Subunit: 237 residues, 4 copies
Amino acid sequence: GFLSGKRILVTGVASKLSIAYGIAQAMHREGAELAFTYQNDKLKGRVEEFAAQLGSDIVLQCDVAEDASIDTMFAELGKVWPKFDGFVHSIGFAPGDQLDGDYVNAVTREGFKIAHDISSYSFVAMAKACRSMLNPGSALLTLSYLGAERAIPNYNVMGLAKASLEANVRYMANAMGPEGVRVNAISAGPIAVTPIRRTVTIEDVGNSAAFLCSDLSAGISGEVVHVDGGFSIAAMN
Amino acid sequence: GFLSGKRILVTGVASKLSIAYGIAQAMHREGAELAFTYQNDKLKGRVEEFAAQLGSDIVLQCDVAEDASIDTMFAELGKVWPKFDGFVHSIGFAPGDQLDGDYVNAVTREGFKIAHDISSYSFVAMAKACRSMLNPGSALLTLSYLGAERAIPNYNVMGLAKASLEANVRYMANAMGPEGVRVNAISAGPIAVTPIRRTVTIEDVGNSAAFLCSDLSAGISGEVVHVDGGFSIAAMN
Amino acid sequence: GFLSGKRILVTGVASKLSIAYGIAQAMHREGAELAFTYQNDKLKGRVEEFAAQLGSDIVLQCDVAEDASIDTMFAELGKVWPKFDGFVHSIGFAPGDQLDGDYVNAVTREGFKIAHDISSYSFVAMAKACRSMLNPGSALLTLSYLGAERAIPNYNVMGLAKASLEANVRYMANAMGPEGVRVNAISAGPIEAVTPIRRTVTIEDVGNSAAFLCSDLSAGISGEVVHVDGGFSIAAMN
Amino acid sequence: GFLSGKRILVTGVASKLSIAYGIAQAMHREGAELAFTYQNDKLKGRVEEFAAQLGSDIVLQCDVAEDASIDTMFAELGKVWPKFDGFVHSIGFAPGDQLDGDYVNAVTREGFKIAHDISSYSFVAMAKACRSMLNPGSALLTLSYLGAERAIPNYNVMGLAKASLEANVRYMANAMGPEGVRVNAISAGPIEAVTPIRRTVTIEDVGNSAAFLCSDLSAGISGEVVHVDGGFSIAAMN
Ligand SMILES: NC(=O)C1=CN([C@@H]2O[C@H](COP(=O)(O)OP(=O)(O)OC[C@H]3O[C@@H](n4cnc5c(N)ncnc54)[C@H](O)[C@@H]3O)[C@@H](O)[C@H]2O)C=CC1
Ligand SMILES: NC(=O)C1=CN([C@@H]2O[C@H](COP(=O)(O)OP(=O)(O)OC[C@H]3O[C@@H](n4cnc5c(N)ncnc54)[C@H](O)[C@@H]3O)[C@@H](O)[C@H]2O)C=CC1
Ligand SMILES: NC(=O)C1=CN([C@@H]2O[C@H](COP(=O)(O)OP(=O)(O)OC[C@H]3O[C@@H](n4cnc5c(N)ncnc54)[C@H](O)[C@@H]3O)[C@@H](O)[C@H]2O)C=CC1
Ligand SMILES: NC(=O)C1=CN([C@@H]2O[C@H](COP(=O)(O)OP(=O)(O)OC[C@H]3O[C@@H](n4cnc5c(N)ncnc54)[C@H](O)[C@@H]3O)[C@@H](O)[C@H]2O)C=CC1
Ligand SMILES: Cc1c(N)cccc1Cn1ccc(OCCc2cccs2)cc1=O
Ligand SMILES: Cc1c(N)cccc1Cn1ccc(OCCc2cccs2)cc1=O
Ligand SMILES: Cc1c(N)cccc1Cn1ccc(OCCc2cccs2)cc1=O
Ligand SMILES: Cc1c(N)cccc1Cn1ccc(OCCc2cccs2)cc1=O
C-alpha cells in the first residue's frame, strides 16, 4: 500500500477508542512497519497486544514529561530502527480541574503549565530527540482540535495548549523542511450542523493521518488539516 | 489502488503541463476510471490522445461560459456514466490585460465579470448540472491559489475570483453534504522561503487531488488544503 | 472630534436603520464634513433630508452598476470637493431569488454576476474613479459579513460576493498604500445568547468603529477585515 | 477625549521606546486616568517619573511570574481605585538563548515553559486577580505579533507563546463578555518596502489603536486580534 517501505513510530495508544489506534490500523493496512510507545506500566500490556496484532514487537516506554524518558526511548528505538521515517504524536493532557466551567475561574498557573508542556512542548521535544534519525522524506504528525481557533466552553486551557501546538507545527515545518522532513497536524472533529451529517470516526482520522505521513502528501507541510466533516467552516445551520 | 471503483470526470487538460494532467495521471495510477472535457476545437486532439493513454474514450466538449454547453456535456456523459463519483474542476481564466501592474488601474468591470464567471461560478454551475448524477460518497475538487488570501502583485482580479471560489467550496460543501457529497479545494503553490526548499510539482498536486477525491478523505469537506510546500505559513525567511 | 478636518463621502444611506446612517451620524458627531449618494430618484428626497441634519447639502445620484454614473457623480462632487479624504462603501445587493433555501439549487449565473458586480466590483470601481481626488492620509471602508468566511444558510451567493469583497480590500490596500491611502472592511454582526457580549451589535457600535477606521487614529491599520460582531465569530457551541 | 471617565492600568512601561509608553501617552491624551506597574526595583525610579508626566502617582511593583505579587499589586491598587475599567498587558519574555537560530535546536522545555508563563499565562492571571474590580464597560488589551500565525526565523518559541496568547484573548473574551468586559489584542508590526503603507508602524500608531480598543468607541469588538502592522501580513511577494 501507499506506506510500504516506511517505518513510523505511533505514540498515544491507550485503548481501542484512541485516535492513535485508528491511525495505527490504517497505517498498517497501507503497509507501514510500526513501533509503539506506552506512557506507563498501566498501559504496557494493552499496547503490547495491539502491537502484536499489527505484526510489531517494538513497544517502548515513554513519558513525554521527562527529557530523559524521551532520550532513553529513542536510544532503545535506534537499536532496531537506526533510521526511520517519522512519528505520530497523539498525546494530550490537561488536569480535569481545568475543564470545569468558566475559563477564567478554572485556569491556574500549574494547570496552564501542564497542559502546554504535555500537549504542545512534547511534540518538539520528540523531534529534538530523534532529529538525526529521520530519513529524508520523513513526516511528523500531531492531533489538534477546533478549540485552538475558537473559544469552546469547558475546553478552557486545552484551547491555548492546542493553539501553541499548531504554532509548533509551523515552526517545526519551517525548521526541519531543509533536511527533508514535513510536519503537519490534523484538526479532528470530536470522536447535525456538520456538512457531512455525521461525526468523524477514528477510521476517518486514521486514513487522513496515513496520507499525511506518506509520500502522497509530499506537497504539504506546516498545515493544519481539518478532518471534522466541514463543521468548522459552517455557521447557523 | 485507493480509487478503484470510482468514476471521476477531469476538466482542464490543455497540455502535459496542466495541473489536471498531473491529477489525471495520479488518479489513473490509483485505479479510477476517467472521463475528460475539452474547452474547444483547439484542445480536442490533445485531450483525446491523453484520454486514450489513460484507457479512456470519454472525451466531451464543455465551455463553462455557457449553461447549454454544460448541460449538453452532462447529457452526453449520462449515456455512458448514468451515475459517477464526482469531478475535478481545473479551470481558471482572467483576460491578460487584468494582470498587468497596479491592481486598481488594471481591473475593469468586464475583466472582473469574466474572471469570476469562469474561475468561480463555473464550479457550482457544473455541480448544479450533474447533482442527481452523483453517487453517495462523491467528491468534487477545485484548484485555488494563495492570491485568494493575500494581495499578490499582478495576480490582481484573479485573487478576488479565487476568494469567491474558496467561499463557493464552503457553500457547496454545506449544501451537498446531506446527500453524501464532499467539496474541497487545493491551494497549490506556483507550478527558497518555502519550508520544503523546492516548488511543488503537478505530481505533488495530483497525489493530494487523488486523496481528496477518494474515500480516504471521507472526513474532509469544505476545506482549502495548502499544497504549496509550507510557503503560506512562513514569513521573513 | 477626531475626524475634524476630514471630508468623507457616505454611500448607501437608505433609511434611519441603514448601517450607513449610523456611520454618518458617528462621523458627523466626530466633526467630519459629509457628502452623500443615493441609488435612484425614489431615494432622493429622503437622502436629501438625512444629509441636511448631518450638516450636508452635497447629495448626488450614483448607481454603481454603471461606470458613467460613478464618473458623473465624482465629477459633480469635484465641483465642491476637488480633494477629499475617502469614502464609506455601504452597498450590497443580490436578487431575492438567490437567498431562498439550498444554495446550489438557488444560485444562477445571472444572480452570481449581479451579486459580485454590485457588492464587490463596485468598491474598486469607486476607488478608480476618485483616485486622483484623494488626499494623503485618506481611508476607504466597506462592510462585510461572516458569510464571507463561513457557509451560512440562505446567505448563499452573497457569501461568495463578500469573500470577493474582502480580497478586494487587500488588493486595494496593497495597490493604494504607497500613495497614502488605507483600505479596510468591517465585518458587522447582523443588525446572541452565544455572542460573547450577549447582545446584537447596533449601527451605533458599527458607526463608532467605522469613524475610527476612517480617521488618523487608525494610521497603522490597512487591508484588515475588523470583526464588529461582539465576538460571535470567535466562539463555538457556546 | 474619548477615554474621559475611564481608569486604566498600564503594565510594561520600561522606557520611552516601550509600546506601553506610546499606549499610555495616547490614553492620557484622550483623558484616561492611568496607573502603572513595574517589574522590579531597577525600573521603579523610571516608571515613577514616566507616570508623573502622564498625570499619575499610582506606581506599583508587579512581577507576573508570582501569583502573590499580582495579588499584592491589585490589593494596593484597590486602596485608590476600588473599581476600574481595564488594563493594558504589554509584557512578554523568552530567555535570549531561545531566539538564536534554528528553532528545534534552540528550544528547551524550560525556555518554552517561561515564554508561555510570562507572555500568555500572565494575561489571564491578571484578569483573575482583578475580575471583581472591573466596571461594566471594561476592556482588557494585550500585544501580539505575526509570529503567532507564521513561522518567523529566530522568533522561535515566542511564536508559540503568542499563539497561546491569542487563544487566551478568545477564551477570556468568551468567559468575561457576559459580565460586561471585552478582551482584545493588537498584533503590532515590528517597532517595509513590502508593507502596504511603506513605513514601519510607530508606538504612536499602536497607541492610538490601543486607546480605541480600550474605549467605548469599540463596544462592538471583542475576542479580536487587530493587525496594526500597516497591512504587512496581508501582502505576499510584494
Ligand atoms: N477525542 C477527541 O474528540 C479529540 C482528540 N484530539 C486529540 O487527539 C489526541 C489523542 O486523544 P485521544 O485518542 O482521544 O485520547 P487518549 O486518551 O486515547 O490518548 C491520549 C494519550 O496521551 C497519552 N499521554 C498523556 N500524557 C502523556 C505523557 N506524559 N507521556 C506520554 N503519553 C502521554 C496517554 O497515555 C494516551 O495514550 C490528543 O492530543 C487529543 O487532544 C483531537 C481532536 C478531538
Ligand atoms: N499554474 C499555477 O501555478 C497554479 C494554477 N492554479 C489553478 O489551477 C487550475 C489549472 O491551471 P493550469 O493547469 O496551470 O493551466 P491550464 O492553462 O493548463 O489549464 C486551465 C484550463 O482552463 C480551461 N478553461 C478556461 N476557460 C474555460 C472555459 N470557458 N470552459 C472550459 N474550460 C476552460 C482551459 O481550457 C485550460 O484547460 C486553474 O484554476 C488555476 O487558476 C492554482 C495554483 C497555481
Ligand atoms: N444588515 C446587516 O445585517 C448587515 C449588513 N452588512 C452590509 O452592510 C451594507 C449595508 O447594508 P444595510 O445598511 O443593512 O442595508 P440597506 O438596504 O440600508 O443598505 C444597502 C444600500 O445599498 C444601496 N444599493 C443597492 N444597490 C445599489 C446600486 N446599484 N447602486 C447604488 N447603491 C446601491 C441601497 O440603495 C441601500 O442604500 C451592505 O454591504 C450589507 O451587505 C454587513 C453586515 C450585516
Ligand atoms: N517591539 C516589537 O517589535 C513588538 C513587540 N510586541 C509585544 O509588545 C509587548 C511589549 O514589548 P516592548 O515594549 O517591545 O518591549 P519592552 O521591553 O519595552 O516591554 C516588555 C516589558 O515586559 C516587562 N516584563 C518582562 N517580564 C515581566 C515579568 N516577569 N513581570 C512583569 N513585567 C514583565 C518588562 O519589564 C518590560 O516592561 C510584548 O508583549 C512584546 O512581545 C508585539 C509586536 C512587536
Ligand atoms: C486527553 C484530554 C484531556 N486530558 C483533557 C481535555 C481534552 C483531552 C483530549 N480531547 C478529548 C475530547 C475532545 O473533545 C472535543 C470536544 C470538546 C469541547 C469541549 C470539551 S471537549 C478534545 C480533546 O482534545
Ligand atoms: C489560467 C490563468 C489566467 N488566465 C490568468 C491568471 C492566472 C491563471 C492560472 N494561474 C497561473 C499561474 C499562477 O501562478 C501563481 C503565481 C503568481 C503570482 C502573481 C502572478 S502569477 C496562478 C494561477 O492561477
Ligand atoms: C442588501 C442585501 C441584499 N440585497 C441581499 C442580502 C443581504 C443584504 C444585506 N445584508 C442583510 C442582512 C444580513 O444578515 C446577515 C445574517 C444572515 C444570514 C443568512 C441570511 S441573512 C447580511 C447582509 O449582507
Ligand atoms: C521582550 C521580548 C523578549 N524577551 C524576547 C523576544 C521578543 C520580545 C518582544 N518582541 C520584540 C521584538 C519583536 O520583533 C518582531 C520581529 C522579529 C522577528 C524575529 C525575531 S524578532 C517581537 C517581540 O515580541
